[PDB]
Enzyme design. Structure first.
Site, PDB file in Angstrom:
ATOM      1  N   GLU A 260       7.313-100.499  33.953  1.00 29.11           N
ATOM      2  CA  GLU A 260       7.750-101.758  33.347  1.00 29.11           C
ATOM      3  C   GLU A 260       6.985-101.910  32.033  1.00 29.11           C
ATOM      4  OE1 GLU A 260       9.839-104.622  33.575  1.00 29.11           O
ATOM      5  OE2 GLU A 260       8.743-104.669  31.666  1.00 29.11           O
TER       6      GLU A 260
ATOM      7  N   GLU B 215       4.289-105.998  21.441  1.00 31.22           N
ATOM      8  CA  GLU B 215       3.210-105.850  22.426  1.00 31.22           C
ATOM      9  C   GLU B 215       3.676-105.153  23.712  1.00 31.22           C
ATOM     10  OE1 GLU B 215       1.206-109.671  22.754  1.00 31.22           O
ATOM     11  OE2 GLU B 215       0.776-109.639  20.601  1.00 31.22           O
TER      12      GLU B 215
ATOM     13  N   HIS C 257      13.162-113.042  31.860  1.00 32.11           N
ATOM     14  CA  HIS C 257      12.036-113.674  31.170  1.00 32.11           C
ATOM     15  C   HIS C 257      11.968-113.264  29.695  1.00 32.11           C
ATOM     16  CE1 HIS C 257       9.834-109.858  31.861  1.00 32.11           C
ATOM     17  NE2 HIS C 257       9.020-110.269  30.907  1.00 32.11           N
TER      18      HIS C 257
ATOM     19  N   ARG D 263      15.248-108.203  36.803  1.00 31.78           N
ATOM     20  CA  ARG D 263      14.365-107.114  36.422  1.00 31.78           C
ATOM     21  C   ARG D 263      13.874-106.348  37.645  1.00 31.78           C
ATOM     22  NH1 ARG D 263       9.034-105.428  36.444  1.00 31.78           N
ATOM     23  NH2 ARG D 263       8.799-106.879  38.199  1.00 31.78           N
TER      24      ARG D 263
ATOM     25  N   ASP E 143      11.314-112.780  38.105  1.00 28.35           N
ATOM     26  CA  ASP E 143      12.437-112.264  37.332  1.00 28.35           C
ATOM     27  C   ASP E 143      13.189-111.288  38.224  1.00 28.35           C
ATOM     28  OD1 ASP E 143      14.212-111.300  35.445  1.00 28.35           O
ATOM     29  OD2 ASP E 143      12.677-110.921  33.918  1.00 28.35           O
TER      30      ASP E 143
ATOM     31  N   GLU F 276      -3.421 -99.015  36.750  1.00 33.02           N
ATOM     32  CA  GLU F 276      -3.490-100.395  36.265  1.00 33.02           C
ATOM     33  C   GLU F 276      -4.816-100.697  35.547  1.00 33.02           C
ATOM     34  OE1 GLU F 276      -1.180-102.844  36.058  1.00 33.02           O
ATOM     35  OE2 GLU F 276      -2.835-103.823  34.989  1.00 33.02           O
TER      36      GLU F 276
ATOM     37  N   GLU G 279      -4.207 -93.813  29.668  1.00 29.83           N
ATOM     38  CA  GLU G 279      -4.528 -92.745  28.719  1.00 29.83           C
ATOM     39  C   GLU G 279      -5.865 -92.067  29.040  1.00 29.83           C
ATOM     40  OE1 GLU G 279      -2.453 -95.357  26.340  1.00 29.83           O
ATOM     41  OE2 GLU G 279      -3.426 -96.421  27.992  1.00 29.83           O
TER      42      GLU G 279
ATOM     43  N   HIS H 192       2.350-111.981  36.563  1.00 27.37           N
ATOM     44  CA  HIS H 192       2.975-111.277  37.680  1.00 27.37           C
ATOM     45  C   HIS H 192       3.868-112.144  38.540  1.00 27.37           C
ATOM     46  CE1 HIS H 192      -0.305-108.491  36.511  1.00 27.37           C
ATOM     47  NE2 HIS H 192       0.725-107.667  36.578  1.00 27.37           N
TER      48      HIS H 192
HETATM   49  N1  LIG Z   1      -2.516 -98.679  28.949  1.00 32.14           N
HETATM   50  C1  LIG Z   1      -2.340 -99.252  30.156  1.00 32.14           C
HETATM   51  N2  LIG Z   1      -2.752 -98.638  31.282  1.00 32.14           N
HETATM   52  C2  LIG Z   1      -2.593 -99.186  32.499  1.00 32.14           C
HETATM   53  N3  LIG Z   1      -2.017-100.384  32.686  1.00 32.14           N
HETATM   54  C3  LIG Z   1      -1.554-101.107  31.634  1.00 32.14           C
HETATM   55  C4  LIG Z   1      -1.690-100.572  30.276  1.00 32.14           C
HETATM   56  N4  LIG Z   1      -1.155-101.481  29.440  1.00 32.14           N
HETATM   57  C5  LIG Z   1      -0.710-102.519  30.200  1.00 32.14           C
HETATM   58  N5  LIG Z   1      -0.961-102.293  31.505  1.00 32.14           N
HETATM   59  C6  LIG Z   1      -0.613-103.133  32.670  1.00 32.14           C
HETATM   60  O1  LIG Z   1       0.783-102.971  32.948  1.00 32.14           O
HETATM   61  C7  LIG Z   1       1.297-104.148  33.573  1.00 32.14           C
HETATM   62  C8  LIG Z   1       2.597-104.572  32.896  1.00 32.14           C
HETATM   63  S1  LIG Z   1       3.474-105.733  33.897  1.00 32.14           S
HETATM   64  C9  LIG Z   1       4.227-104.678  35.109  1.00 32.14           C
HETATM   65  C10 LIG Z   1       3.681-104.981  36.504  1.00 32.14           C
HETATM   66  C11 LIG Z   1       4.436-104.289  37.652  1.00 32.14           C
HETATM   67  N6  LIG Z   1       4.528-102.811  37.424  1.00 32.14           N
HETATM   68  C12 LIG Z   1       5.808-104.882  37.820  1.00 32.14           C
HETATM   69  O2  LIG Z   1       6.827-104.283  37.465  1.00 32.14           O
HETATM   70  O3  LIG Z   1       5.941-105.998  38.313  1.00 32.14           O
HETATM   71  C13 LIG Z   1       0.185-105.191  33.482  1.00 32.14           C
HETATM   72  O4  LIG Z   1      -0.418-105.388  34.764  1.00 32.14           O
HETATM   73  C14 LIG Z   1      -0.832-104.624  32.514  1.00 32.14           C
HETATM   74  O5  LIG Z   1      -2.160-105.011  32.870  1.00 32.14           O
END
Ligand SMILES: Nc1ncnc2c1ncn2[C@@H]1O[C@H](CSCC[C@H](N)C(=O)O)[C@@H](O)[C@H]1O
Ligand SMILES: CNCCN1CCC(c2ccc3[nH]c(-c4ccccc4OC)c(Cl)c3c2)CC1
Ligand SMILES: CNCCN1CCC(c2ccc3[nH]c(-c4ccccc4OC)c(Cl)c3c2)CC1
Ligand SMILES: Nc1ncnc2c1ncn2[C@@H]1O[C@H](CSCC[C@H](N)C(=O)O)[C@@H](O)[C@H]1O
Lengths: 329, 329
Positions: free
Chosen positions: A109, A118, A271, A20, A17, A66, A95, A11
């Site tokens: 994001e 990923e 990034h 972004r 970044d 989250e 989900e 984070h």
């Molecule tokens: N299925 C899911 N449900 C909820 N959160 C998820 C997820 N898969 C990934 N994440 C979360 O989504 C985040 C991606 S990083 C984005 C962080 C923030 N929204 C920003 O823009 O700065 C991570 O914290 C990760 O833990």
């Protein structure tokens, strides 16, 4: 807490970044007319920053979902900025989380290295169907993938290293250049690296376009996204392979100025950088040398969240060639 | 060949570390009187560079022993510089290789991160007993370990990041500083990082000394190397922990000028950098604040080639504390 420095690094990197973070911010603010008094779902809210941007743009309620334990810090940031009446941090995966209602918009994001390594795309598409109202707003709404031939200046410097050992040491190691070249290029691994713009040898070609609103995008993706490409080189150079990168686009809103967040080396660094696909060895191109082929992005056999790339290509007079790559996950 | 880019990266890094490479070179050349017409064993010769330095210094025969497949490139470099009559590349581990004779000297690049993490020291001590003549020359001949309290400027910048988010984004995240601080410092992992000299808060203290000529050094090492230390801080600062680093020393020869290769942040940077031991949280020290304790370097229970550190320490008026660390291997 158990090894929570990873969460902090993710984070820090994400917020630092600026390109972004500011893209999402302006993307959101430009849709003020669509968001004012409306409801938003932030898929993977992290520190909560994007959910707070939606509040800034006039959303009545934001559901910040989250899965990681970072949700507790997101909650702390929301209340520390006095937004706990408008932004509600909901812990758990998107989900399985339970919202009190459907939403007017989704912000997320979700993009991974090479877009789809990923990534949170399936979570986003899942949450769209389940929770976003018909005709609702997606931020960003689309993604585009680009490919171009490159001459990687950093690699060239690494390969030329051995022929310069003699200068200061009196031991000549020019003989290792071939070994070095074959080792650093002959692997089948996607290299994430930031290129400079002058490493690009031709006009970048778009090979895929993802409209996130489309139903059954999820199924098309599993078949693999990609396509043909053709371009011609600008001038004489040692081509070491291709770079791929992506952009995402936010709807224009009332001003009708769609915002593009690009990871191209012609735009400010992110990034994500670029994903580099090396040929087994360098190939000399000339002005107008034609470079063509086909690229497909796929889920890997082992882990489908890991990115695989099938490349078929042809450089000028050389025979057609192929190479399989995968991200080191 | 199968994934040989690692081998290329190791030796690019090793040769590009000019301080290291030139230290060995000058260390070797200064012992010209001991090496001229004599025989040398290069333990882990890699690209063969140090073996060639020994030839440059007048050795009649050098046995370059290399376990990795890089030995083939070492052989190519030796013949490419016309030294195949004086330098013989012998593939295989040093503990099983067959030399035609004992040697007058050993040279070896054996030092790992924090000196003893995944190092070739036991191989060197094994090859000393087996192959080096009684009273023979060891290059380097000794090693010394140092510890000092530090204020890591990079960490301070990372921790202060969250309190600056507000400036450009209008979202205040000062509340995450504690979470960030506890996460980046509360782990039990040795961090390899280059410090600047002004991060050092006191006169560095030597806590161990390894005389490589001593028989039964191998046994003493298994019990753990370390010792007590005491120092006093220079001025007011937020102490984040300790740094450890090492030097190795080459014998003086005829000029009687022993050469020191240091990895201290007061000397030019090397690929080894320094090993950083973070406290669970910052501690404010003052001018003359007394910092004392005991440090032991040990083999880890799991993998004994992996480095473990037991730290016992006391900062000023604070109670005595302890922390166990390990390198992420
Ligand atoms: N299925 C899911 N449900 C909820 N959160 C998820 C997820 N898969 C990934 N994440 C979360 O989504 C985040 C991606 S990083 C984005 C962080 C923030 N929204 C920003 O823009 O700065 C991570 O914290 C990760 O833990
Ligand atoms: C249920 N289902 C929801 C989708 C989920 C999933 C897992 C891995 C995936 N990998 C990809 C994918 C598709 C094209 C290119 C790259 C991809 O990921 C590396 C998709 Cl789409 C994808 C979807 C599998 C489980
Ligand atoms: C036979 N024997 C030769 C020595 C070898 C070995 C293996 C791991 C080791 N680890 C260390 C070691 C000792 C002190 C501090 C750190 C160490 O390595 C992390 C030594 Cl010494 C050491 C020796 C074990 C097998
Ligand atoms: N037991 C052993 N026997 C022989 N070689 C070994 C060994 N353990 C490690 N090595 C080799 O020793 C080298 C350490 S790097 C040193 C390379 C070269 N002497 C230089 O100074 O630049 C590596 O190439 C590694 O493969």
């Amino acid at each position: 807490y158990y090894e929570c420095y990873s969460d902090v690094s993710v984070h820090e990197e994400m917020i630092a970044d600026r390109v972004r973070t500011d893209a999402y911010r302006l993307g959101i603010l430009r849709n003020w007319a669509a968001l004012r008094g409306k409801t938003v779902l932030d898929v993977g809210a992290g520190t909560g920053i994007l959910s707070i941007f939606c509040a800034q743009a006039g959303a009545r309620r934001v559901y910040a979902v989250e899965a990681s334990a970072i949700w507790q810090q997101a909650r702390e940031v929301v209340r520390f900025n006095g937004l706990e009446d408008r932004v509600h941090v909901l812990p758990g995966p998107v989900e399985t989380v339970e919202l009190p209602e459907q939403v007017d918009a989704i912000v997320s994001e979700w993009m991974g290295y090479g877009l789809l390594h990923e990534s949170m795309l399936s979570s986003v598409l899942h949450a769209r169907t389940k929770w976003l109202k018909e005709g609702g707003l997606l931020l960003p709404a689309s993604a585009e993938l680009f490919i171009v031939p490159i001459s990687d200046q950093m690699l060239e410097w690494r390969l030329g290293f051995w022929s310069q050992v003699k200068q200061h040491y009196g031991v000549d190691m020019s003989c290792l250049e071939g070994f070095a070249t074959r080792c650093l290029m002959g692997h089948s691994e996607i290299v994430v690296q930031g290129l400079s713009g002058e490493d690009v040898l031709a006009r970048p070609q778009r090979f895929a376009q993802l409209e996130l609103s489309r139903a059954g995008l999820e199924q098309e993706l599993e078949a693999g996204v990609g396509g043909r490409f053709r371009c011609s080189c600008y001038g004489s150079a040692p081509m070491h392979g291709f770079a791929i990168w992506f952009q995402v686009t936010f709807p224009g809103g009332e001003s009708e100025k769609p915002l593009v967040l690009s990871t191209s080396p012609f735009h400010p660094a992110t990034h994500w950088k670029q994903a580099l696909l090396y040929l087994n060895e360098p190939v000399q191109v000339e002005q107008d040398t034609d470079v063509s082929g086909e690229i497909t992005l796929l889920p890997s056999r082992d882990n489908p969240r890991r990115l695989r790339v099938l490349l078929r290509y042809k450089v000028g007079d050389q025979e057609e060639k192929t190479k399989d790559f995968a991200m080191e996950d």
